[PDB]
Amino acid sequence: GAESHELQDVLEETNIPKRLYKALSLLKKEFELSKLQQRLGREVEEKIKQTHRKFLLQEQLK
Amino acid sequence: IIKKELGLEKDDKDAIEEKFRERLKELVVPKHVMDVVDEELSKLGLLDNHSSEFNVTRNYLD
């Protein structure tokens, strides 16, 4: 999901090892960014579920 | 929640406590009024931000 600049830089890499390593590094960047998004989403999902679970505990007490 | 106020800024609604206290800290004052102030502050902490009760509490504390 990188912009056109990273793709152009990958094209600029004449040697196959260099372009392949750049592509793998960009794959790592994509995976880690998606990991940050997934971790944050799961964190807040559990937090909101726990917020509702607080009301569930309230109703159980009632 | 992901930003955790790192995308917005602290609403300062809780900061109203200290704002009013420092707005009063400097005054040599009787004691009954302090306990009334503390009760109003506790109600403010309990009362929701959007409540009309909360708005009247804010005006009375002003």
From Swiss-Prot, chain A:
It comes from the Eukaryota. It is found in: Mitochondrion matrix. Signal peptide: none annotated. Duodenum, heart, lung and liver, but not thymus. Homohexamer. Organized in a ring with a central cavity. The ATP-binding and proteolytic domains (AP-domain) form a hexameric chamber, while the N-terminal domain is arranged as a trimer of dimers. DNA and RNA binding is stimulated by substrate and inhibited by ATP binding. Interacts with TWNK and mitochondrial DNA polymerase subunit POLG. Belongs to the peptidase S16 family. It is linked to CODAS syndrome: A rare syndrome characterized by the combination of cerebral, ocular, dental, auricular, and skeletal features. These include developmental delay, craniofacial anomalies, cataracts, ptosis, median nasal groove, delayed tooth eruption, hearing loss, short stature, delayed epiphyseal ossification, metaphyseal hip dysplasia, and vertebral coronal clefts. ATP-dependent serine protease that mediates the selective degradation of misfolded, unassembled or oxidatively damaged polypeptides as well as certain short-lived regulatory proteins in the mitochondrial matrix. Endogenous substrates include mitochondrial steroidogenic acute regulatory (StAR) protein, DELE1, helicase Twinkle (TWNK) and the large ribosomal subunit protein MRPL32/bL32m. MRPL32/bL32m is protected from degradation by LONP1 when it is bound to a nucleic acid (RNA), but TWNK is not. May also have a chaperone function in the assembly of inner membrane protein complexes. The Lon N-terminal domains are crucial for the overall structure of the protein, maintaining it in a conformation allowing its proper functioning. This is Lon protease homolog, mitochondrial. The lineage of its organism: Eukaryota, Metazoa, Chordata, Craniata, Vertebrata. The gene is LONP1. The chain holds residues 340 to 401 of 959 of the full protein.
UniProtKB/Swiss-Prot annotation, chain B:
ATP-dependent serine protease that mediates the selective degradation of misfolded, unassembled or oxidatively damaged polypeptides as well as certain short-lived regulatory proteins in the mitochondrial matrix. Endogenous substrates include mitochondrial steroidogenic acute regulatory (StAR) protein, DELE1, helicase Twinkle (TWNK) and the large ribosomal subunit protein MRPL32/bL32m. MRPL32/bL32m is protected from degradation by LONP1 when it is bound to a nucleic acid (RNA), but TWNK is not. May also have a chaperone function in the assembly of inner membrane protein complexes. It is found in: Mitochondrion matrix. It comes from the Eukaryota. It is linked to CODAS syndrome: A rare syndrome characterized by the combination of cerebral, ocular, dental, auricular, and skeletal features. These include developmental delay, craniofacial anomalies, cataracts, ptosis, median nasal groove, delayed tooth eruption, hearing loss, short stature, delayed epiphyseal ossification, metaphyseal hip dysplasia, and vertebral coronal clefts. This is Lon protease homolog, mitochondrial. It comes from Homo sapiens. Duodenum, heart, lung and liver, but not thymus. Homohexamer. Organized in a ring with a central cavity. The ATP-binding and proteolytic domains (AP-domain) form a hexameric chamber, while the N-terminal domain is arranged as a trimer of dimers. DNA and RNA binding is stimulated by substrate and inhibited by ATP binding. Interacts with TWNK and mitochondrial DNA polymerase subunit POLG. The lineage of its organism: Eukaryota, Metazoa, Chordata, Craniata, Vertebrata. The gene is LONP1. Coiled coil: none annotated. Belongs to the peptidase S16 family. The Lon N-terminal domains are crucial for the overall structure of the protein, maintaining it in a conformation allowing its proper functioning. The AP-domain (ATP-binding and proteolytic domains) has a closed-ring conformation in the presence of AMP-PNP and its N-terminal entry gate appears closed. Upon ADP binding, it switches to a lock-washer conformation and its N-terminal gate opens.
